[PDB]
Amino acid sequence: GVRKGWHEHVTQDLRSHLVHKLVQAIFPTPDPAALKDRRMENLVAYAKKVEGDMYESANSRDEYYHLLAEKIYKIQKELEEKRRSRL
């Protein structure tokens, strides 16, 4: 929704690329081939929906990509320490 002409400055590859990393972050993948698996449609389904939220939340791809990168970043360190030892 909303007319946001910056959509011409962002491609499917860019968005799907970020979304792919989202999966890497939401799903600590045991192998890169799990990223092209049937479980992947689910993982990427989340990633697409989340990226879509921030895509629409932002007023530039630069912005959407920045703020989304911040969320993924905190998630990755969250997962690492939660797995390592925090509780």
Binding site: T11, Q12, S16, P28, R38, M40, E41, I72
Partner: protein
């Protein structure tokens, strides 16, 4: 201290998705195509988007 709490979604959801390794899924995978920022974003994307 609470599974909800707010802000604790990170821990919960990521733990749930951690255990999602032993889960099935659907049937499809993914797709891409294009090229604008990723192309020479290499070092920046690694650092800021976080490819650990």
């Amino acid at each position: 201290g609470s599974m909800s709490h707010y802000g604790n979604q990170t821990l919960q959801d990521l733990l749930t998705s951690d255990s999602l390794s032993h889960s099935d899924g659907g049937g499809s995978g993914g797709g891409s195509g294009g090229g604008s920022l990723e192309c020479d974003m290499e070092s920046i994307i690694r650092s800021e988007l976080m490819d650990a």
